[PDB]
Amino acid sequence: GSAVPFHGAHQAGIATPVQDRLHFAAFDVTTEDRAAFVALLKEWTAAARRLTAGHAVGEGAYGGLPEAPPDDTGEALGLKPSRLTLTIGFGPSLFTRFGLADLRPEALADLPKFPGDNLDRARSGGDLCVQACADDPQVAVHAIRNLARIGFGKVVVRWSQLGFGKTSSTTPDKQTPRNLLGFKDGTRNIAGTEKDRLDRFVWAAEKDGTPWMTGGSYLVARRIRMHIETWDRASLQEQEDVFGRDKGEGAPVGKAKERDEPFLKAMKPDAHVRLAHPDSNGGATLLRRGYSFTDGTDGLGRLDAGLFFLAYQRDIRTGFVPVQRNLATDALNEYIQHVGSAVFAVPPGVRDADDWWGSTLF
Amino acid sequence: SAVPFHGAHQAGIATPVQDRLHFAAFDVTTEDRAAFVALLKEWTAAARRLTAGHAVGEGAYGGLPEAPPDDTGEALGLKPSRLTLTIGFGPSLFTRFGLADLRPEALADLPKFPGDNLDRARSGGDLCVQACADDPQVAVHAIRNLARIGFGKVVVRWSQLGFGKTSSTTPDKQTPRNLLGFKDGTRNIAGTEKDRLDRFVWAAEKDGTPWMTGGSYLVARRIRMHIETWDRASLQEQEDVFGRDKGEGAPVGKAKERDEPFLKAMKPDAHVRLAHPDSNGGATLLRRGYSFTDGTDGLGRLDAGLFFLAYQRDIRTGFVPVQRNLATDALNEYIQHVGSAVFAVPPGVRDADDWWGSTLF
Numbered sequence: 193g194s195a196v197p198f199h200g201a202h203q204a205g206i207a208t209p210v211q212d213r214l215h216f217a218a219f220d221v222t223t224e225d226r227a228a229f230v231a232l233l234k235e236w237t238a239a240a241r242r243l244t245a246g247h248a249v250g251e252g253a254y255g256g257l258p259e260a261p262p263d264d265t266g267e268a269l270g271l272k273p274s275r276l277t278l279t280i281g282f283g284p285s286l287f288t289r290f291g292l293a294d295l296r297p298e299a300l301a302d303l304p305k306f307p308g309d310n311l312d313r314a315r316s317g318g319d320l321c322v323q324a325c326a327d328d329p330q331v332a333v334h335a336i337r338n339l340a341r342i343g344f345g346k347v348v349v350r351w352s353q354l355g356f357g358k359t360s361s362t363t364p365d366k367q368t369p370r371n372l373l374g375f376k377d378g379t380r381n382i383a384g385t386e387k388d389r390l391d392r393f394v395w396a397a398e399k400d401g402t403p404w405m406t407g408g409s410y411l412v413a414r415r416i417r418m419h420i421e422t423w424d425r426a427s428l429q430e431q432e433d434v435f436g437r438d439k440g441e442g443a444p445v446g447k448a449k450e451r452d453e454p455f456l457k458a459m460k461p462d463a464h465v466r467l468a469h470p471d472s473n474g475g476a477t478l479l480r481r482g483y484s485f486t487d488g489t490d491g492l493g494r495l496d497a498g499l500f501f502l503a504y505q506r507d508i509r510t511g512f513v514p515v516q517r518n519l520a521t522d523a524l525n526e527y528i529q530h531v532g533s534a535v536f537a538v539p540p541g542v543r544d545a546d547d548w549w550g551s552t553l554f
Numbered sequence: 555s556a557v558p559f560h561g562a563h564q565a566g567i568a569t570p571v572q573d574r575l576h577f578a579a580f581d582v583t584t585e586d587r588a589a590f591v592a593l594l595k596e597w598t599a600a601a602r603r604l605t606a607g608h609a610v611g612e613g614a615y616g617g618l619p620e621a622p623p624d625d626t627g628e629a630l631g632l633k634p635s636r637l638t639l640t641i642g643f644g645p646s647l648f649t650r651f652g653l654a655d656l657r658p659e660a661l662a663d664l665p666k667f668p669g670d671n672l673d674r675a676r677s678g679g680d681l682c683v684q685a686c687a688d689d690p691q692v693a694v695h696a697i698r699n700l701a702r703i704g705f706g707k708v709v710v711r712w713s714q715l716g717f718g719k720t721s722s723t724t725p726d727k728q729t730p731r732n733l734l735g736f737k738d739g740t741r742n743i744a745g746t747e748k749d750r751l752d753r754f755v756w757a758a759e760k761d762g763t764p765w766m767t768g769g770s771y772l773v774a775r776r777i778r779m780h781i782e783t784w785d786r787a788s789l790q791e792q793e794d795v796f797g798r799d800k801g802e803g804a805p806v807g808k809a810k811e812r813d814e815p816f817l818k819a820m821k822p823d824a825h826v827r828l829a830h831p832d833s834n835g836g837a838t839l840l841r842r843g844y845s846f847t848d849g850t851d852g853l854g855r856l857d858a859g860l861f862f863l864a865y866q867r868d869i870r871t872g873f874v875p876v877q878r879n880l881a882t883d884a885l886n887e888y889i890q891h892v893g894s895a896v897f898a899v900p901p902g903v904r905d906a907d908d909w910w911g912s913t914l915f
């Protein structure tokens with residue numbers, strides 16, 4: 193229930209321990225006034241300082257002038273901060289505005305097309321994003337709702353996604369959660385404590401070529417539908433061969449414990465862990481921070497389940513791209529389909545009560 | 555951390571309200587009474603396992619390699635999480651298996667109400683399973699696996715996820731707030747009032763349908779809220795809509811949330827004034843609904859609202875008169891009913907040998 197500090201060299205919500213619920217929104221900008229947009233970034237930062245501390249935005253949710261709408265919509269009243277983090281990111285399409293083209297980072301690479309892609313252009317892309325994570329979904333919704341409200345006229349919501357439960361871990365000392373295919377997910381991820389691994393694989397550095405990004409990261413979001421009907425009729429052995437780990441313990445094939453190191457040659461050549469593993473990808477390493485979703489039925493008598501996949505990396509070209517290319521022959525492909533996609537530059541942290549989101553860019 | 559599954563009544567009605575909801579409505583595809591009864595027995599066995607935190611069948615792993623696991627596995631290593639599973643039968647069930655003359659009179663079709671805009675695909679259903687739990691993944695896993703067991707005999711018609719309070723951070727003697735920002739649930743039938751439940755909630759034998767004694771009747775309504783319109787309304791307009799203030803939830807003129815309302819001090823079309831049993835000939839409901847937020851629609855708006863669930867001893871004398879009295883509710887400006895269904899919720903599974911629906915079949 194405690195708060196997660198908002199200030200830092202880095203934005204919270206990345207190396208932070210992974211909170212139970214997610215509300216992810218992508219925004220398009222509807223003002224051509226750079227001054228208006230900068231004032232928005234400052235106002236949103238002020239709201240976030242309140243929101244992540246458990247306080248109502250502006251002058252509160254009630255007790256103001258009767259004839260004016262309340263500053264805060266009020267549904268988080270009486271709730272604790274619940275580890276709320278707010279993480280902001282800039283889409284490639286934002287740099288065509290306010291004269292930012294010269295500032296687009298080289299590591300904000302558009303993704304190539306991948307075999308199997310069935311991307312819905314409505315649930316893809318976006319000028320900027322806010323990732324709201326909390327252990328209470330009312331807290332996460334309230335923050336997105338109130339950010340959008342404050343941005344009325346300057347931004348609209350392009351698309352959003354709710355994650356009802358995490359499928360990722362930055363704390364290997366705690367239990368690994370399972371995804372909706374029933375497998376532990378997050379065993380071999382980067383930990384929030386591994387400060388040297390985060391420096392090499394996650395945080396952008398001055399020398400990488402884009403000084404305003406020093407301290408930030410790069411985010412890939414993929415909405416991935418799961419063919420649970422097809423999966424749920426596969427034998428237990430078939431499911432375990434697809435991944436290279438047993439279902440119960442989550443141990444690499446042949447071994448006894450979830451955290452024993454995989455021996456890649458014992459796995460099938462198209463096994464998911466074998467293909468995604470850094471050793472198979474020239475050392476490429478990712479920080480996975482995704483969440484499960486279900487969005488009703490598919491209209492055909494079945495539940496609609498999937499995974500909202502989020503990966504943070506130091507450079508999209510040396511993180512997500514090579515690992516995803518190596519998955520062209522993944523046995524998991526038979527059961528999944530990518531149906532939404534977006535990349536964002538996540539700027540450095542808000543340094544103190546005078547700093548603001550995107551201040552190094554603007 | 556668990557709720558007993560066996561009882562005179564099904565759990566999940568008067569038992570403590572859990573944090574999360576997965577509601578699913580199923581359509582029946584088989585015509586065979588025997589095949590259906592068989593399924594009901596299978597379902598009860600799996601429910602016993604799930605509500606105690608165990609995997610269904612022979613488990614999620616450790617079986618024949620060339621067999622699909624009995625349990626899909628995503629709840630492994632989680633606790634029972636106060637999971638309750640409540641099953642109900644829709645009016646359309648009674649057109650099959652020759653049960654037409656066993657439909658309870660109290661399971662009345664709903665009239666059309668002013669402002670209804672019901673989506674057909676998210677309405678109705680031959681039967682429903684309400685899964686509540688403090689962990690959403692426990693709830694989802696239950697529905698997922700019940701649907702799997704029933705494949706070939708039932709399909710999922712529509713499904714709804716919902717959330718109330720988060721109990722690991724909020725006190726249970728603290729009223730939750732709906733997404734309009736008002737405390738919700740202040741004047742409600744509580745699970746402790748065993749005589750109000752008998753008078754208002756539970757079906758009794760002399761009511762007319764003996765197989766439903768110990769049961770209840772469920773109305774579900776998917777109510778969209780026009781969030782962005784509501785949020786532009788003044789604080790005074792919002793409080794005028796309900797007849798309570800937003801901060802404390804006190805009825806107008808009163809000081810504490812739990813002070814009894816003085817209905818003449820509220821606006822004639824205030825929501826509380828129109829819904830109160832005194833304005834409805836004593837009609838009283840047990841509300842057990844959950845908030846929802848499914849995402850954003852095509853115009854950038856929050857697809858969010860209240861998935862309203864009401865239990866009552868007779869639909870004709872509970873939900874119907876009260877909803878009728880809301881014809882002029884000032885709240886109507888800000889909400890839209892977009893989905894609807896009714897169900898007869900049978901009595902409870904009495905012991906290890908009993909099963910869902912046994913009194914009917």
Ligand code: HEM
Nearest residue numbers: 371375376377378379380416465468469470499515516528
């Ligand atoms: C629904 C889609 C996916 C599912 C269900 C899934 C599932 C899993 C599972 C069960 C594991 C083993 C446990 C672990 O170490 O975390 C794993 C590992 C991993 N996955 Fe995936 N995954 C999916 C998509 C992806 C994608 C799209 C990528 C990258 C583009 C990816 C990259 C990785 C990596 C790097 C590992 C760690 C392998 C290692 O270093 O040992 N996964 N995944």
Ligand code: HEM
Nearest residue numbers: 732736737738739740741777826829830831860876877889
């Ligand atoms: C979006 C839809 C709705 C919202 C946001 C809402 C909200 C509220 C609120 C804030 C209260 C006051 C506190 C309390 O719960 O006692 C209330 C009371 C109540 N509402 Fe609603 N409600 C909705 C729909 C309905 C419907 C459809 C019905 C019945 C058909 C209903 C029946 C009642 C009743 C019986 C009370 C208790 C009044 C009393 O006896 O004091 N509500 N509602």
